[PDB]
Each structure stands twice: as structure tokens, then as C-alpha cells.
DNA sequence: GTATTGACTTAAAGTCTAACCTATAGGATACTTACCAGGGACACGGCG
RNA sequence: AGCGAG
DNA sequence: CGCCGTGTCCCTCTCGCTGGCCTATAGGTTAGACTTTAAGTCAATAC
């Protein structure tokens, strides 16, 4: 039984802490972190129109 | 000294003075310029002394060139306050001035949060004393030892070491990809839930206030400054309505008693 | 030594300077129109490597002509200071304050500028004041770009100080880590497991 | 580092007034050891799964 | 809101000096070594001649 | 989270643009002929000198002009010399220097 | 499915919901935009079956 | 790429960005001029028949 | 203000006059906050 | 319940005095120069 | 720094 | 005026997790209590 249990992997967020110099909330399950929406994902969205 | 005296004397005679003869005036200006020339020559000569002295303050606090320039300022001050009639070598006197200038600059322009000098000296003292008691006791001296060796209350040792906590950098890669900056939560941002909570609180408070009689609403409003953010006492509301202070006080008491009734409390609890 | 001998002897007939202010004077005494016209004539009539260097120079000498931009913006007399909350000083848990790594470069610039002011006010030999001016130039350079010239200005731990240009360049810069890609609310993550009944 | 501080102070040491205990400063050595065993990359957090 | 430091002496923007090609050098036709010498107080330069 | 703060705080208070305290724009003039408006509140004396955006202090542009005084130049090398030497020896040294230069020129 | 985590984003506005429902719906994207060959066709276990 | 060179040259040239591509619109956080963001689909007028 | 009144974005050299026109003051002292009261 | 007066006590200033920080100066044996990548593109100095 | 998916 | 060699600059994937010295002077600041004043409070009363 490997130590990659889903209980430590699940995470969700609707609102929480926001970074200091910029907004775009803190990342990480340790904080209440939002999931990074990078440039590749944004290109995929642009391709979808 | 001769150049300085010539400059001062001509400054004196620049106002209600005498038209000095061309030859004498020309010679005297040569003397003043020679005085400044001698000052520059001396400073250029002892720049090496300044560098050699500042060598021993390197590696801690600030950069090396800043130390050299502060030492140069100190040496200029020493040359300003140097006496030869006392018959002593220039280096002996200028060393103390350069040391003082460098140490003062270290005290001032070395820490992002400036601790004034006297505090700086007492903390540097604390550090040295704990270093020596570390040399002797071996284990880091506990606050008691420092307080004893420093003739201040131990709580003062605490605060002297609290003021001297150097900041850190929020641009440190915490790994050894992530800077410490983007791990720190802005604790003064609109949390977006208390904001809507406050909006609905104001809405429901306004409604429940509209329930009670109009005069009652007015008195409580202008008592806590809800209408425009300015709270006032009984006297002001009495003045504006042209009634003695006591009536406003009485109606306020009645208003509080009414609003405290369980009827108009379950519509306002869960907001406190 | 040669310069000083010249100045004391044929001091008039020529003005010489040293440092950024000298470049300031050069740009001041520089008519862009005549230089551009001469360069255009040289590129049109001449040929070879001389024409190549002439042509590259006309990609910067034309830019300051086509637009009504002065070539003076290169030389600074005032350095803008970024708003404080873009370089925050935060009381982290435990009281330990956290600087922004830009207050250090700004502090260095201001220290050296004030020291230059005091050195000029007192009256100092040209050696010390010129050294101070060179240090001020280096401080502004380090503020705008660390490590571009000489060893980078290092902070505690023997690491370079994050300058004012490092915020913009790279995969971890501002243009690419905080503008085209952002962290978003209303998002989650989890391990996926096949569902064939869906 | 301790050697360098010893040499530097030796010039300002009054002859016959000095003993190795008052001539040796151990702080650089302990500081180096402590900064190695913590924050050195080859001194890794023990992996006990 | 921004501030500004009033430099006691002028300085040159590094982006227009060190960034190859040296735009200051191309504008003034000064070799990059010469520009670096002048700007960092390593060699004098003549700005006017009657 | 490390949970830092910028010190200061927030204050949600419904922004009002309607009932606002009365203001009296006061003009100041720096040394380099640069005017600068400053919206001071009426219920306070308008100061006679303001550190304007220019970075240098400017006096009020109306009348008044109190024109105070301050300490003369913090110190000076001549003043420091006079705290360790007197006039007679300085004059004697000046005479020695003058005679030396005169001998240099004409002997 | 050997630990392949994935992220879930929630469209909020009417336009976002409409785009997610119409443009990006998984049952609307069968053919690969590259070559047009189907990408949702059965594979592995289903092909064997 | 090459942010410093690009900005140096753009500053020297007084280049004005018309904000017409997809990356610029994404950067400034306004609708990209593609797909549903173009001027013919965005301002569709909708009303009951 | 609004992303509709964002037609262009010009970049150019900022002369010293522009730099001191942006500024609301001049940082003259190399200080950040008080050591004890922790205030600007 | 809603119109008042006459005491009766109370916190908030408003101010004077005292100590504890703060900006600053000074210190006279003599000491005088610190310290492991590649891969591509472009530009500068030598040589023919 | 170790570590996971591709 | 070409060809060559050397120096310098920019680039090198996405997402995610865990945790590691001393002295002397002068001047400004605050804290602490005293005195005053606007402020909150109670008791009896008349309509
Ligand atoms: Mg996998």
C-alpha cells in the first residue's frame, strides 16, 4: 500500500488566502490553495474559442 | 591654517573693508588656494590609512566601498580637527576619528529597520558579553547572566535582543522554485464572506430598525452614527430636535429594551 | 596624467568630463538631424563593413528622429521609487519582519546619493567624490539589473539580490508566472479513478 | 576561519598576556558545523516511510 | 503612488548601455569599452572644442 | 500559512461622495517657481511652509511671509580651529607664510 | 489510473456555463482536431472485448 | 522571450500596442478577439420572437 | 478604469521630468519603519 | 406613556511635570593598496 | 532538498 | 575590404506534494497624575 493516499491528495477551494504582492490566491493544499491555470491551459481555452 | 585665516579675513573685509593692493591680494589668494591644495594633498595621502583601517570592518553589515567612503568622511573630519602644536603623529589622531565614523555608519546604514545608535551600542554590547560568557560558561549564557553582566533588568535583555532581530527576505527560494513571498497570506484582504455578511447585516439591521417607530429609529441611528458614520451623545441629538437631553436618553432606553425582545433578536443574531 | 597636464596648460580650447554627466553633455551637444543625414549619406554612397556599422547605427539614430523622443532619457537625474506595497515589509508570524529585497537596493542608492551630497557640500578631493559617483552609478545599475556588470550585489547567505528587472524576465518572471498564468478560485484537484458506469 | 581570526587578533595581542583559551574563538567552527547539518543539501531529512 | 530619488549626480540607465548592442554607443559612436570607461570614471572625454 | 500583515488595517465604511467636509485649497510656491496646491481643511491654520511634491520646501504664496530664522552653518573648519588656536599665533603664521612667498618671488 | 491527479474548475457566469456546456462538452469533442480521427473510440479492454 | 531587449527597443522606438492579438488581450484581462469574443458574436441582440 | 477604454498601450523613455511628475514626493532618507513602534 | 428639573457620579480630555529615549559630538603611542552542460546568435579585434 | 504523473 | 577566432548573451515542459569600546550635552518623547469639562445616570413629578 503505497504512501500516495487519496486523503492527502484531495483538495478543493472556493475562496481563501490571497498572496501578498499579487492576488491570484496562494497555491498549495497546505494553504487553501487555488489550482494553477497556466499558459498551456489558457492556450487550450483559446483554441476552444 | 594660513589659507583658512586668509579666507576668513577676506570674508571680513568683503563687507565695509578696504581695497587691498593687487600684489598683496594676489599673493593672499595664492595662500588660500595653497591651503585647500594642502588639505587635498593630506587627504589623498591618508586615503591608504583609511582603507587599511576599514579593512578590519569587512564582511559584516555593509559593503567595503561604503566603509571606505565613511572612513574618508571621518578622515576629513580628523583633518579639520587636527592639531600639531600638541606634537603627535597624524595617524594616531586620525585613527580614532576614522574608527568613530565607520562605527557610526555601521550603526546607521547597516540594518533595514534603523535602530538608533544608543540602542545599537547596547545590543552590540549584549552580543559581545554573551560571546564572552559563551567562551567561559560554554553553553550560551541564559538571560540571567547577561542581565547581571549588563546592569539592566533581564526583561531589558529580552527587549534588547528583540529590537535586534534582522528582517528576512520574501524573495528567498525556500527550497534550498518557491519564494517565501508567495507563501504569505495577505491578512488584510476583503475575505469576500465577511463582506457579504456585513452587507446583509446592514440590510437586515436597516429593516428591523424600520420596524420600530420612526423617532426611535432616528435616535438610535444618530446615537451610533449609522446614518453617516458620526456618533454623538445625548446633548447633540437633544439640540437638533430641540428637546432636552433627558428625553433622548429615555427614548433610547425604550428603544434598546424593544430591540432586545426575542422577536427582533433572532433576526439579528448569528451576526455577532 | 596627460589629461591634467593638458588642463593646466591648454585648459581652455577644450572641455573634458568624466562619468554619466559627461555623456549627458555629449547628448546635449548632439544634433540628431545632422548625424542622421550624414549617416544616410554614408550608407548610400559608401560600402563595406563601414556601411554595415553605419546601417546598424541608423536603427537607433533613426528611432530618436522618427519619434519626438529625446535621446536624453538614457541619462537619469531622478530615479522613480516603486510604491511600497509592491515591495512589502510584512510582520510574519513570530514578529520576524520580511523585507522585499528591493528596499535594500533602494537603501543602497539613497545612502550613496546622500553621501555624495554631503561629500560635495563639504568639499572633497576629486578622488573621493569621483569614487562616490562611481559607486552611485553602480548602485543604480544594481537596482535596475543585478549582475549585468561585475559580480551581482549579494545579500545574506551569499545570494544575489533580486533586482528590479529580475521581476520581469524568465519562466518565473512577472510576464509568464503571474499574467498569462494565474491561480484561480473555485478549483480543486484529486486522483482520478475509472468510472465505466458514467 | 578560526585560523584567520586568530592571526588577525594576534597582532593586537599583548605579548605574555595571552593563552590559547583566550586566543581561540570556537564560534566559526560551531557555526560552520551547525550550518552544515542544517540547510546543507547533503544533510537530508531522514526518509522513514 | 510612486516616489522619486533626486540623484546628486546624473547616472546612465543600464539597459541602454550594457545591453548589446550598446544603444548609447551606437547613438554617440563610442566603442562599448570607451563608454564603460567614461561612465565608470576610468577615462576622461572631450565634450567641446573651440 | 505564515500569515503576515502589512500592519495598518482595512476599514469597510460605505464610501460617501455627497456630504464631505469643506476644503480650502492652499497654493504654495517652491524655489524653482513651481506652484503646488494642497487641500487643507478649513478648520486648521494653513502652514507657512510645505514640503511639496517637488521635494523642496515652499512657502505660502499669499501675504503673511513670517520669515523665521535658523541656526547658522552647523559648524565650520575655521570655527573648529578657533576652539584650539587663537588669533595672534595664526597671524604670526600668516606673516611667516607671506614673507616666505615674498622671498620666493623677489627674495 | 496510476495516480494521475487532475484539476476541476467551476465556470460561474452565464457565458462561462454556456461555453462549457456547448463548446467544451466531452460528448461534443470526439474527433481529434489534429487529424480528425476519433479520440473517444474504444481502446484496450473494449477493443479486446 | 528576451523581455529586456524587447522593452529596450520598444522604449527607444515609442511603439504603441493596439491590443489586437490574443496574448495582449489575455494579459490585460479583456476578451480575446477569437471565438465567442469577436465583434459579430459578442454583441448579438437577443429578444423573444 | 475599464477594459473598453484601453485602446492602446504606449511605451517610451521616461525623462526626469516625467519621473518627478509621477512622484508624489521624494524619498530623502534611507529608512523603512521604527524599530520599536514598527510604524512608517 | 411622555413631558422635565435637580443633583450625582464618570470618562475624556487638557495640561504640567519628570525620565527616558535620540541626534550628535568626541576620543592624540603608532598603525597607510582587500579578497565541470551545450547550442545558437551576435559583436569586436587580428590577420591577410 | 527528496517525491509523484506524463 | 573577407575570413577567422574569441568573448558575451539568451535559452533550455506542465502540474503537484512534503518540510527547515566608553563619556558628556542637549533636546524630544511619553507616562503619570491633577484639574476641568462634556457626559452618563437616578430620583421625584406633573400632565
Ligand atoms: Mg500515469
Give the resolution value in Å: 3.1
Within 8 A by CB and 6+ apart from F22, the residues are F41, F42
> I37: left (phi > 0), else alpha (psi -120 to 50), else beta?
alpha
Asked if A35 lies within 8 A of C180 by C-beta distance, the reply is no
I20 chain-E contacts, CB cut-off 8 A: 4, 6
Q: Is the dihedral of CA F4, I27, B61, B174 positive or negative?
A: positive
- I24–chain F nearest CA distance, Å: 5
Nearest to C149 by CA among E31, B55, E39, E28: E39
**G2 is an annotated ligand-binding site residue:** yes
Q: Chain C within 8 Å of G3 (Cβ-Cβ)?
A: yes
DSSP string, C16-82: EE-SHHHHHHHHHT--HHHHHHHHHHHHHH--SHHHHHHHHHHHHHTHHHHSS--GGGGEEEEEEE-
CB–CB of C153/C142 below 8 Å?
Answer: yes
Nearest to C34 by CA among C65, C63, C60: C65
Within 8 A by CB and 6+ apart from A27, the residues are A33, A34, A36, B182, C183
Nearest-angstrom CA–CA distance, H27 and B244: 63
Nearest-angstrom CA–CA distance, C63 and H14: 8
- A49–chain B nearest CA distance, Å: 31
Q: For residue A39, which nucleotide's C1' is closest to its Cα?
A: L14
CA-nearest residue of chain B to C99? B169
* Secondary structure (H, E, C), chain B: CHHHHHHHHHHHHCCCCCCCCHHHHHHHHHHHHHHHHHHHHHHHHHHHHHHHHHHHHCCCCCCHHHHHHHHHHHHHHHHHCCCCCCCCCHHHHHHHHHHHHHHHHHHHCCCCCCCCHHHHHHHHHHHHHHHHHHHHHCCCCCHHHHHHHHCCCHHHHHHHHHHCCCCEECCCECCCCCEHHHHCCCCCCCCCCHHHHHHHHHHHHHHHHHHCCHHHHHHHHHHHCCCCCCCCCHHHHHHHCCCCHHHHHHHHHHHHHHHHCHHHCCCCCCCC
Number of H helices and E strands in chain G, helices first, is 2, 1
CB–CB of F53/F36 below 8 Å?
Answer: yes
Q: What are phi and psi of E46, to 5 degrees?
A: -90, 130
CB–CB of E34/E43 below 8 Å?
Answer: yes
Nearest to B222 by CA among B252, B266, B185: B252
Q: Chain A within 8 Å of C46 (Cβ-Cβ)?
A: no
Within 8 A by CB and 6+ apart from F87, the residues are none
Residue nearest to nucleotide K1 (CA to C1'): D41
Check residue A33 and report its DSSP letter: P
C190 chain-G contacts, CB cut-off 8 A: 5-6, 8
Q: Chain C within 8 Å of H3 (Cβ-Cβ)?
A: yes
Q: Chain I within 8 Å of B201 (Cβ-Cβ)?
A: no
Q: Chain A within 8 Å of C10 (Cβ-Cβ)?
A: no
Judged by 3 or more CB pairs under 8 A, whether E touches A is: no
Q: State the method.
A: cryo-EM
CB–CB of B97/B77 below 8 Å?
Answer: yes
Asked if G8 lies within 8 A of C192 by C-beta distance, the reply is no
> C25: left (phi > 0), else alpha (psi -120 to 50), else beta?
alpha
Q: Chain G within 8 Å of H4 (Cβ-Cβ)?
A: no
Nearest-angstrom CA–CA distance, B215 and B230: 18
Å: F76 CA to K6 C1': 75
Asked if B189 lies within 8 A of A21 by C-beta distance, the reply is no
D26 chain-B contacts, CB cut-off 8 A: 135
Q: For residue B177, which nucleotide's C1' is closest to its Cα?
A: K1
Q: Collapsing DSSP states into helix, strand and coil, what is residue F25?
A: strand
Strands of F49-51's sheet, edge to edge?
F35-41, F23-29, F57-60, F49-51
Nearest-angstrom CA–CA distance, C97 and C89: 7
Nearest-angstrom CA–CA distance, H28 and C180: 9
H36 chain-G contacts, CB cut-off 8 A: 15, 19, 23
Give Cα I9 to chain centroid, integer Å. Answer: 18
Please state the length of chain G: 49
Please state the length of chain A: 49
Nearest to F91 by CA among B29, B45, E32, B4: B4
Asked if B184 lies within 8 A of C92 by C-beta distance, the reply is yes
CA-nearest residue of chain D to B138? D26
Within 8 A by CB and 6+ apart from B13, the residues are B20
Q: What are phi and psi of A42, to 5 degrees?
A: -65, -35
Residue nearest to nucleotide L20 (CA to C1'): D39
> H34: left (phi > 0), else alpha (psi -120 to 50), else beta?
beta
Q: Collapsing DSSP states into helix, strand and coil, what is residue F50?
A: strand
Find the helix or strand (DSSP H, E) in which F36 lies.
strand F35-41
Residue nearest to nucleotide J21 (CA to C1'): B118
Asked if B187 lies within 8 A of F102 by C-beta distance, the reply is no
CB–CB of E13/E22 below 8 Å?
Answer: no
Asked if I34 lies within 8 A of B113 by C-beta distance, the reply is yes
CB–CB of H35/A49 below 8 Å?
Answer: yes
Asked if H36 lies within 8 A of A42 by C-beta distance, the reply is no
CB–CB of C132/C119 below 8 Å?
Answer: yes
B186 chain-F contacts, CB cut-off 8 A: 4, 6
Furthest-apart CA atoms within chain B: distance in Å: 106
| Touching A: B residues 173-232, CB under 8 Å | 181-186, 189, 191-193
Å: B206 CA to L46 C1': 37
Asked if C187 lies within 8 A of A10 by C-beta distance, the reply is no
Beta-carbon contacts below 8 Å between B and D: 9
Nearest to G8 by CA among B176, C113, B65, C192: C192
CB–CB of E11/C20 below 8 Å?
Answer: yes
Cβ-in-10-Å burial (0-12, 13-18, 19+) of C110 comes to buried
CA-nearest residue of chain D to B131? D27
DSSP bridge pairs for F60: F28
C90 chain-F contacts, CB cut-off 8 A: 4-6
Nearest-angstrom CA–CA distance, C82 and F52: 19
Q: Is the CB of B173 under 7 A from strand K?
A: no
- F7–chain A nearest CA distance, Å: 12
Cβ-in-10-Å burial (0-12, 13-18, 19+) of C172 comes to middle
| Touching G: C residues 132-171, CB under 8 Å | none
- F54–chain A nearest CA distance, Å: 28
Asked if C125 lies within 8 A of B43 by C-beta distance, the reply is yes
Q: Chain H within 8 Å of G14 (Cβ-Cβ)?
A: no
Amino acid at each position: 500500500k503505497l504512501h500516495h493516499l487519496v486523503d492527502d491528495k484531495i483538495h478543493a477551494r472556493s475562496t481563501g488566502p490571497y498572496s501578498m504582492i499579487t492576488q491570484q490566491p496562494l497555491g498549495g493544499k497546505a494553504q487553501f490553495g487555488g489550482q494553477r491555470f497556466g499558459e498551456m491551459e489558457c492556450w487550450a481555452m483559446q483554441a476552444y474559442g | 591654517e594660513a589659507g583658512l585665516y586668509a579666507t576668513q579675513l577676506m570674508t571680513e573685509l568683503s563687507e565695509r573693508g578696504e581695497k587691498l593692493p593687487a600684489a598683496q591680494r594676489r599673493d593672499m589668494m595664492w595662500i588660500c588656494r595653497d591651503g585647500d591644495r594642502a588639505k587635498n594633498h593630506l587627504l589623498e595621502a591618508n586615503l591608504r590609512l583609511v582603507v587599511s583601517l576599514a579593512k578590519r570592518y569587512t564582511g559584516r553589515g555593509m559593503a567595503f566601498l561604503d566603509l571606505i567612503q565613511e572612513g574618508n568622511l571621518g578622515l576629513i573630519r580628523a583633518v579639520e580637527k587636527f592639531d600639531y602644536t600638541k606634537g603627535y603623529k597624524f595617524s594616531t589622531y586620525a585613527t580614532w576619528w576614522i574608527r568613530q565614523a565607520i562605527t557610526r555608519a555601521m550603526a546607521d546604514q547597516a540594518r533595514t529597520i534603523r535602530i538608533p545608535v544608543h540602542m545599537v551600542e547596547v545590543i552590540n554590547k549584549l552580543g559581545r558579553i554573551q560571546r564572552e560568557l559563551l567562551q567561559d560558561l560554554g553553553r550560551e549564557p541564559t538571560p540571567e547572566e547577561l542581565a547581571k553582566e549588563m546592569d539592566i533588568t533581564p526583561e531589558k535583555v529580552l527587549e534588547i535582543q528583540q529590537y535586534a532581530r534582522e528582517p528576512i527576505s520574501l524573495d528567498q527560494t525556500i527550497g534550498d522554485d518557491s519564494q517565501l513571498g508567495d507563501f504569505i497570506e495577505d491578512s488584510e484582504a476583503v475575505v469576500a464572506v465577511d463582506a457579504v455578511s456585513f452587507t446583509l447585516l446592514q440590510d437586515q439591521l436597516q429593516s428591523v430598525l424600520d420596524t420600530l417607530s420612526e423617532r426611535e429609529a432616528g435616535v438610535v441611528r444618530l446615537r451610533f452614527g449609522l446614518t453617516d458614520g458620526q456618533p454623538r451623545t445625548l446633548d447633540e441629538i437633544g439640540q437638533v430636535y430641540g428637546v432636552t437631553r433627558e428625553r433622548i436618553r429615555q427614548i433610547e432606553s425604550k428603544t434598546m429594551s424593544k430591540l432586545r425582545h426575542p422577536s427582533r433578536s433572532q433576526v439579528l443574531r448569528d451576526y455577532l | 596624467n596627460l589629461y591634467r597636464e593638458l588642463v593646466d596648460r591648454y585648459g581652455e580650447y577644450f572641455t573634458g568630463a568624466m562619468g554619466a554627466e559627461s555623456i549627458q553633455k555629449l547628448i546635449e551637444n548632439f544634433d540628431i538631424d545632422a548625424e542622421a543625414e550624414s549617416l544616410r549619406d554614408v550608407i548610400r554612397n559608401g560600402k563595406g563593413q563601414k556601411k554595415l556599422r553605419a546601417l546598424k547605427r541608423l536603427k537607433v539614430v533613426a528611432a530618436f528622429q522618427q519619434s519626438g523622443n529625446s535621446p536624453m532619457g538614457m541619462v537619469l537625474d531622478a530615479v522613480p521609487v516603486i510604491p511600497p506595497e509592491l515591495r512589502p515589509m510584512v510582520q510574519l508570524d513570530g514578529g520576524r519582519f520580511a523585507t522585499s529585497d528591493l528596499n535594500d537596493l533602494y537603501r543602497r542608492v539613497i545612502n550613496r546619493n546622500n553621501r555624495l551630497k554631503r561629500l560635495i557640500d563639504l568639499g572633497a578631493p576629486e578622488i573621493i567624490v569621483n569614487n562616490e559617483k562611481r559607486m552611485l552609478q553602480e548602485s543604480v545599475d544594481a537596482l535596475f539589473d543585478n549582475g549585468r556588470r561585475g559580480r551581482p550585489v549579494t545579500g545574506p547567505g551569499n545570494r544575489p539580490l533580486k533586482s528590479l528587472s529580475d521581476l520581469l524576465k524568465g519562466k518565473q518572471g512577472r510576464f509568464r508566472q503571474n499574467l498569462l498564468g494565474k491561480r484561480v478560485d473555485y478549483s480543486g484537484r484529486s486522483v482520478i479513478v475509472v468510472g465505466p458506469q458514467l | 576561519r578560526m585560523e584567520r581570526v586568530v592571526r588577525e587578533r594576534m597582532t593586537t595581542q599583548d605579548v605574555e598576556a595571552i593563552t590559547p583559551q583566550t586566543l581561540i574563538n570556537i564560534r566559526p567552527v560551531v557555526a560552520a558545523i551547525k550550518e552544515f547539518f542544517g540547510t546543507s543539501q547533503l544533510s537530508q531529512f531522514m526518509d522513514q516511510n | 503612488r510612486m516616489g522619486h530619488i533626486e540623484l546628486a549626480a546624473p547616472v546612465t540607465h543600464i539597459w541602454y548601455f550594457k545591453g548589446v548592442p550598446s544603444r548609447l554607443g551606437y547613438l554617440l559612436d563610442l566603442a562599448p569599452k570607451d563608454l564603460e570607461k567614461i561612465i565608470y570614471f576610468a577615462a576622461y572625454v572631450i565634450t567641446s572644442v573651440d | 500559512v505564515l500569515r503576515g500583515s502589512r500592519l495598518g488595517a482595512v476599514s469597510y465604511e460605505t464610501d460617501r461622495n455627497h456630504d464631505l467636509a469643506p476644503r480650502q485649497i492652499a497654493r504654495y510656491r517652491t524655489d524653482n517657481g513651481e506652484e503646488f496646491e494642497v487641500p487643507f481643511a478649513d478648520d486648521a491654520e494653513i502652514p507657512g511652509t510645505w514640503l511639496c511634491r517637488n521635494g523642496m520646501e515652499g512657502t505660502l504664496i499669499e501675504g503673511d511671509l513670517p520669515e523665521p530664522k535658523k541656526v547658522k552653518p552647523p559648524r565650520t573648519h575655521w570655527d573648529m580651529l578657533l576652539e584650539r588656536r587663537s588669533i595672534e599665533e595664526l597671524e604670526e603664521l600668516l606673516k611667516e607664510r607671506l614673507e616666505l612667498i615674498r622671498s620666493r618671488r623677489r627674495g | 489510473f496510476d495516480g494521475d491527479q487532475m484539476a476541476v474548475h467551476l465556470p460561474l457566469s452565464a457565458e462561462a456555463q454556456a461555453e462549457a456546456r456547448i463548446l467544451m462538452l466531452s460528448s461534443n469533442n470526439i474527433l481529434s482536431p489534429a487529424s480528425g480521427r476519433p479520440l473517444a473510440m474504444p481502446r484496450l479492454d473494449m477493443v479486446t472485448g | 522571450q528576451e523581455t529586456t531587449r524587447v522593452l529596450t527597443d520598444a522604449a527607444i522606438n515609442c511603439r504603441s500596442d493596439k491590443l489586437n492579438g490574443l496574448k495582449e488581450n489575455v494579459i490585460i484581462g479583456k476578451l480575446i478577439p477569437a471565438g465567442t469574443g469577436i465583434n459579430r458574436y459578442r454583441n448579438i441582440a437577443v429578444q423573444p420572437t | 478604469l475599464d477594459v473598453n477604454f484601453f485602446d492602446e498601450l504606449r511605451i517610451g523613455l521616461a525623462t526626469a521630468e516625467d519621473i518627478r511628475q509621477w512622484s508624489y514626493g521624494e524619498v530623502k532618507k534611507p529608512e523603512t519603519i521604527n524599530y520599536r513602534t514598527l510604524k512608517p
